[PDB]
């Protein structure tokens, strides 16, 4: 009875729409105002998703809040690369059904480097034959992959939680009938996971810079995302809060 995995499938957010006006010709300000608003909408779903994850109440409430804010970008990216793989086979970026980026939009957004990388990623879901159940567990582990150098309020409990999510991914790995095939798979998946973090880093750096000059470029930030960018994000960019990398 795959209890952990039933839960992940049970709690998985459904489709979220950006509200972008696709009938207007593409502008940078409107594309990014629509991404910012999509970000907030996806955030609301991530909070409800996270709070219903196995063990999550083990966490101190402040840690609960902190890891959601820190991991948000990496989660969005990961799920987006999967959405782009499943729906359109990596030919475009399926940010949402009403906000799909072709290469013209990738360039018009001014995050082309990041967009092409998220396209690398989307294609790896196919190349590595990632199963839906590998995706779900991987996405969960991602929520517990970014910690502060000064420590959480209860670091022991987070460390127990991460260990056990890694356990679950081990069990998922295990077709089974070969430890060496299990390791090869483990290597590949953890490498895929690690590669989400530089992308989120580039994306964080870009949105930081975009907020700071947003009045200059008529890009609107919702209240909440402006707080997160200005309050949590710089902790990541300043090196106070760091991804946990499997490799080096």
């Amino acid at each position: 009875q795959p209890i952990f995995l039933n839960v992940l499938e049970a709690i998985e957010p459904g489709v979220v729409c950006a509200g972008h006006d696709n009938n207007q010709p593409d502008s940078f300000a409107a594309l990014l105002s629509s991404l910012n608003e999509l970000g907030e909408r996806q955030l609301v779903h991530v909070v409800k998703w996270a709070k219903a994850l196995p063990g999550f109440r083990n966490l101190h409430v402040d840690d609960q809040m902190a890891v959601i804010q820190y991991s948000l970008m990496g989660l969005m990216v990961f799920a987006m690369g999967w959405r782009s793989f499943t729906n359109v086979n990596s030919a475009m970026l399926y940010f949402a059904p009403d906000l799909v980026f072709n290469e013209y939009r990738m360039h018009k957004s001014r995050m082309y480097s990041q967009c092409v990388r998220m396209r690398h990623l989307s294609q790896e879901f196919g190349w590595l034959q990632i199963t839906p159940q590998e995706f779900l567990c991987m996405k969960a582990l991602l929520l517990f992959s970014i910690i502060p150098v000064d420590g959480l309020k209860n670091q022991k409990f987070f460390d127990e939680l991460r260990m056990n999510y890694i356990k679950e991914l081990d069990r998922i790995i295990a077709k089974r009938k070969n430890p060496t095939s299990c390791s090869r798979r483990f290597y590949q998946l953890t490498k895929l996971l690690d590669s989400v973090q530089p992308i989120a880093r580039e994306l964080h750096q870009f949105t930081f810079d975009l907020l700071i000059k947003s009045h200059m470029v008529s890009v609107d930030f919702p209240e909440m995302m402006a707080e997160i960018i200005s309050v949590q994000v710089p902790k990541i960019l300043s090196g106070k809060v760091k991804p946990i990398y499997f490799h080096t």
Partner: peptide, 11 residues
């Protein structure tokens, strides 16, 4: 700060 706390405390 309070905007994300409030979301988190609410839905």
């Amino acid at each position: 700060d309070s905007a994300f706390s409030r979301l988190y405390t609410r839905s």
